[PDB]
Design a binder for this molecule. Structure first.
Ligand SMILES: [Zn+2]
Lengths: 41, 50, 52, 40, 129, 117, 236, 67
RNA sequence: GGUUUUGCGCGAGUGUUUGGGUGUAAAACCCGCACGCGUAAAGGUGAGAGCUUCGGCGCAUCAUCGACC
């Protein structure tokens, strides 16, 4: 007798995980760009 | 919802139901209601003058 | 109820009006797989952190 | 008087055209898997 | 603009829906529909079945006609082609003649759900003055 | 067009529903006086004079004497049994005669005449 | 046609009355002589009744049990009408997809998932019946993964009418989301059987043909995501 | 029709509304989880709702409303 | 009594309320024939919003060349 997770919530959680992964990748690339920018300036 | 239950004289449902008419699925427009009620509330008015 | 079904077909020159909106539930319209799929990524949050 | 007669005939023809137009509209207007047939 | 002049609550519902669409998609179609929803009734003239029948001629017969106005019946048009039209309002004779020809009638929210960005749509305006 | 003293000659109609009630009560009084009888008299079908209204027909004033004689209704009995008589109108054609004669025999087919005493 | 007095009681406001009507429809379908002569109109009317039966169900666990039992209704029909029953289900869902509100939509998504899972489970008997697989895959080819936008139901005759139904896009998107989960749940994704691999490849080819020849960007993106699942044999 | 009843309540008239001249409106409805008239707190314009109320005995209950 | 603009209903039609019917009675509800006003008695090229299978299709409107009375 366990209440299942609703299906639109499943879709929302999948999209949120994708957005979190993209955000982490963009943060890493922007950190690297910041370091190279500091050296070039 | 297609049907509405019918209640008895004791307040308990009889077991019979009725089909809900189309007029309960009509648009609910407060502006039309406001306009027509403002017009219609003036129609039982008696004139006054000095 | 039965004559309420009956008398709205007996008015001459009047038919029951068609709405300009089919589904009046806006949360069903916006928070649906149909629209959420083509939506671009958000450009901000509800509250913006002060930069300077 | 000929001018007057054709003005009167023009007015009558306009009226007859209006009645024919009303007759045309009525004709045009005349030309189980349901809620109130299944849940009745 | 900031608000529609219409007092129709369902019109304001459509305005909220197309504000969201125009904001969250890069589709000029949604922005044009929102702009025409803000517009007044004299600036949204009725589009007749004959004007749509003319515009549905070259390669647009498979496209969905979008009219931000009321589609009216035209008595001059003897044969109504098959047509998928999405509009604010339909007159009774226009809707009956569209559905009697095998066509279909849509509101703007069904269009926003079926075609959120306006792909393969035919935007039509009524004649000015 | 307010050149004259129109203030002294404004007619309002706040007594429109009261006059409608008065007219309906007058019809009820006519019904009370003429208890099984209809409150109206039978009137013929006539064609509208002008060319503009020639296509349509309306109710006339009373039946012609030739129409009453052809329908089998005597002239002196006709006003006493609910039929209106007009001595000014003429038939002038065999098509208004037949129509109003048909109307009169249709009226005769649906009439319950009571003896004098 | 068929004497079905339980249809109007499936949309009542009493859960006990609706349960009795559902048991009446259960007993109606278990009768082989009555359920053998099932046309399209009868299963459409029955599925309208079941739609309103789920529509009036209130709490989450009753909704889950009702969706499970409406999915398990497939096992109590003759073979010659299971395809018509499932076509009636898909026709009802296509008719009433955009009319459901945002709170009642979720149990109907669950109903679609459970009915698809029961349809995939029905194909089991090579260990898979090719006729049953063909019927289920054709019904998957005509409502959710169709290359055509519209479906014709019944035939243009002097007795029966014509039902011309569009496929809504949201049904296609939801089936695209859930089909990999259903075929993993019922067991098409094992790496040893050739026939299960052929079934999976046929469904993936249907999804691919939907992806290449569509005009909806939502359908294109969702089918690209569906074909990119890591549980599929290609993306593994 | 949550949005339509919300428009009717908020823009025309609600019997549970207390309008103050101090920058906030209040909700007189007993099932309002916060006694404030806004979109999220409306017990009428929200089909799914939840509140917490205390009985005269002192026992506190959670009240849940579904569509 | 004219005229401009905003909202609304219906829309090539529209307007119940002179009047009739009805009524829980100056309210509300219904409409038989008229009548007023209005309608009746698709071309090329170039721009052009928007859409696009990237090949193109092209609203309203304007310019220009044409067609009919
Ligand atoms: Zn409130």
């Amino acid at each position: 007798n366990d209440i299942l997770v609703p299906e639109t919530l499943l879709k929302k959680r999948k999209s949120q995980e994708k957005a979190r992964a993209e955000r982490a990748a963009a943060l890493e690339k922007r950190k690297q760009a910041n370091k190279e920018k500091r050296q070039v300036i | 919802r297609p049907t509405v239950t019918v209640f008895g004289a004791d307040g308990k449902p009889t077991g019979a139901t009725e089909v809900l008419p189309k007029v309960f699925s009509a648009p609910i427009r407060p502006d039309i209601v406001k306009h027509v009620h403002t017009g219609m509330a003036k129609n039982k008015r008696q004139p006054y003058a000095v | 109820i039965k004559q309420l079904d009956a008398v709205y077909e007996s008015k001459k020159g009047f038919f029951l009006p068609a709405n300009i909106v089919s589904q009046a539930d806006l949360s069903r319209l916006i928070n649906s797989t149909e629209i959420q799929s083509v939506l671009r990524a958000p450009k901000g949050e509800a509250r913006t952190k002060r930069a300077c | 008087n000929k001018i007057r007669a054709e003005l009167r005939k023009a007015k009558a023809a306009r009226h007859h055209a209006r009645m024919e137009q009303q007759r045309d509209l009525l004709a045009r207007k005349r030309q189980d898997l349901d809620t109130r047939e299944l849940f009745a | 603009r900031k608000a529609p002049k219409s007092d129709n609550v369902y019109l304001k519902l459509l305005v909220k829906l197309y504000r969201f669409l125009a904001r969250r998609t890069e589709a000029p179609f949604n922005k044009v529909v929102l702009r025409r929803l803000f517009m007044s009734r004299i600036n949204r003239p009725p589009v007749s079945l004959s004007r749509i029948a003319r515009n549905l001629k070259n390669g647009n017969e498979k496209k969905t006609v979008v009219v931000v106005a009321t589609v009216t019946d035209d008595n001059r048009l003897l044969q109504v082609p098959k047509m998928e039209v999405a509009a604010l309002r339909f007159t009774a004779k226009a809707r009956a003649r569209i559905e009697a020809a095998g066509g279909r009638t849509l509101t703007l929210d069904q269009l926003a759900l079926e075609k959120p960005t306006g792909a393969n749509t035919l935007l039509l305006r009524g004649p000015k003055n | 067009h307010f050149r004259k003293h129109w203030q002294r000659r404004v007619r309002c109609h706040f007594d429109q529903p009261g006059k409608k009630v008065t007219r309906r009560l007058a019809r009820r009084a006519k019904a009370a006086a003429l208890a099984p009888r209809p409150v109206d008299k039978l009137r013929p079908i006539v064609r509208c004079p002008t060319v503009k209204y020639n296509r349509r027909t309306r109710l006339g004033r009373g039946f012609t004497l030739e129409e009453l004689k052809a329908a089998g209704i005597p002239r002196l009995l006709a006003p006493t049994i609910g039929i209106a008589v007009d001595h000014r109108r003429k038939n002038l054609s065999e098509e208004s005669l037949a129509a109003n004669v048909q109307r009169l025999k249709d009226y005769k087919a649906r009439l319950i005449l009571f003896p004098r005493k | 046609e068929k004497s079905m007095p339980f249809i109007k009681h499936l949309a009542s406001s009493d859960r006990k009355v609706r349960t009795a009507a559902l048991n009446s429809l259960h007993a109606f379908l278990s009768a082989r002589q009555v359920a053998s002569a099932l046309t399209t109109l009868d299963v459409l009317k029955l599925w309208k009744g079941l739609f309103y039966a789920l529509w009036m169900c209130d709490r989450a666990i009753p909704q889950q049990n009702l969706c499970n039992e409406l999915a398990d209704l497939i096992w109590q029909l003759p073979r010659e009408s299971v395809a018509t029953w499932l076509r009636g289900f898909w026709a009802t869902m296509a008719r009433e997809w955009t009319g459901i509100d945002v709170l009642r939509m979720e149990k109907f998504l669950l109903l679609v998932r459970r009915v698809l899972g029961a349809s995939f489970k029905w194909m089991k008997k090579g260990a898979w019946d090719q006729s049953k697989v063909d019927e289920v895959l054709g019904l998957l080819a005509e409502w959710p993964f169709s290359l055509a936008e519209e479906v014709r139901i019944t035939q243009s005759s002097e007795k029966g009418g014509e039902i011309v139904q569009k496929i809504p896009v949201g049904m296609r998107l939801h089936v695209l989301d859930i089909w990999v989960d259903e075929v993993e749940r019922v067991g098409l994704l094992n790496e040893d059987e050739e026939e299960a691999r052929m079934i999976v490849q046929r469904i993936s080819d249907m999804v691919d043909a939907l992806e290449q020849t569509t005009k909806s960007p939502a359908v294109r993106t969702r089918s690209k995501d569906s074909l990119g699942d890591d549980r599929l044999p290609a993306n593994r | 029709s949550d949005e339509i009843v919300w428009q009717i309540i908020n823009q025309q008239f609600c019997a549970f509304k207390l309008k103050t001249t101090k920058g906030q409106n209040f909700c007189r409805n007993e099932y309002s989880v916060s006694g404030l008239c806004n979109r999220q707190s409306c017990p009428l314009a929200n089909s799914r709702y939840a509140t917490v109320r205390q009985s005269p005995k002192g026992t506190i209950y959670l009240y849940i409303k579904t569509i």
